[PDB]
Design a protein around this ligand. Structure first.
Ligand code: NI
Length: 341
């Protein structure tokens, strides 16, 4: 049965609620982004209206085979009436196609559902600036002060510089990057651009990337592995055994691998600056864990919420333990007392 924090009061609407069967009283199912914990339950047999971004709608139709007649894509930054209620979709600065949803309830209440997001000061100048929000359904993934990581720009700078140095020292090195979902495409695209290579990958991943409206994409990716010196592999294969086995398959073209594992936060963020990061190495194989996050840091989260000044906060992440819930509620009260709302 559908939990309370996925229902929007005073509407027929649910958010990211496809794994509960037919939800009583739901006339429209919103989907914030195409990540599996959120789309869990959708297939070609789904027969209710789904509201989402154009990019999420491309993935629904091509990857999950949802029939076209039940996909309702909405443009961003645009007031739209859905089943008699005004809604707006905003960019969530998460993965491609990810949105936040503003709902303007018939009784005058305004609700923001962030989906998954990486808060940014640029959001303070979206359509959020123009009016008050009463309730915030908040992505609280890293809601604790220990969660620090660098900007995405710093992380990409480190990766480009590392890859370009390695391959310039040894023109016979292969670069490999791990993936298990959409998001974080900048990691492998920026490295392939510095090296003058396309990115090589499986037919299934090429298919997924072709749904994302990235400009000039036919110029950046390929299924011809032999023509590429940046390869994408499943995240599970990014270990010494899996990489050794991949190197065997490349027909003696290469004699070294440099591999990247984009993770979220890891406890080595407590001690080591991005500049100082070092790989794990075994023989002719090196593996870098790089803290490329598509979720808010604690400080980014706090800044957003103190700017928005919501009357009530409903967390959507870390909601299963009393310890987590009590910790989050303590930070929300701190933020409110400090800023004075
Ligand atoms: Ni996500």
């Amino acid at each position: 049965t559908c939990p309370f924090y996925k229902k929007i009061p005073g509407t027929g609407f649910t958010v990211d609620a496809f794994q509960y069967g037919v939800v009583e009283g739901c006339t429209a199912y919103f989907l914030t982004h195409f990540h599996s914990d959120h789309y869990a339950g959708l297939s070609k047999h789904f027969t209710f209206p789904v509201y989402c971004s154009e990019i999420t709608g491309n993935l629904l139709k091509n990857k999950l085979h949802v029939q076209e007649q039940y996909i309702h894509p909405l443009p961003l930054d645009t007031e739209c009436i859905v089943n008699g209620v005004k809604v707006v979709l905003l960019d969530a600065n998460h993965c491609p196609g990810a949105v936040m949803i503003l709902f303007y309830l018939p009784n005058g209440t305004v609700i923001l559902h962030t989906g998954d997001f990486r808060a940014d000061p640029s959001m303070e100048r979206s359509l959020l600036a123009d009016q008050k929000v009463h309730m915030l359904y908040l992505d609280t993934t890293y809601c604790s002060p220990e969660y620090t990581f660098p900007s995405q720009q710093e992380v990409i700078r480190f990766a480009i510089n590392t890859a370009f140095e390695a391959v310039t020292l040894n023109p016979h090195a292969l670069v490999v990057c791990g993936t298990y979902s959409i998001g974080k495409e900048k990691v492998f695209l920026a490295i392939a651009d510095v090296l003058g290579s396309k990115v090589g990958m499986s037919q299934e991943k090429y298919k997924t990337l072709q749904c994302l409206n990235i400009p000039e994409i036919n110029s950046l990716i390929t299924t011809d592995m032999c023509s590429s010196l940046v390869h994408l592999l499943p995240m599970m294969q990014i270990n010494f055994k899996g990489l050794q086995s991949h190197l065997k398959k490349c027909g003696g073209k290469y004699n070294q691998i440099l591999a990247f594992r984009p993770t979220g936060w890891t406890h080595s963020n407590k001690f080591t600056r991005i500049a100082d990061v070092i790989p794990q190495t075994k023989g002719n194989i090196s593996i870098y864990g790089i803290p490329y996050s598509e979720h808010s840091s604690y400080l980014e989260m706090k800044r957003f919420v103190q700017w928005l000044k919501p009357q009530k906060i409903i967390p959507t992440v870390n909601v299963g333990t009393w310890k987590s819930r009590s910790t989050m509620e303590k930070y929300f009260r701190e933020w409110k007392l400090e800023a004075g709302y």
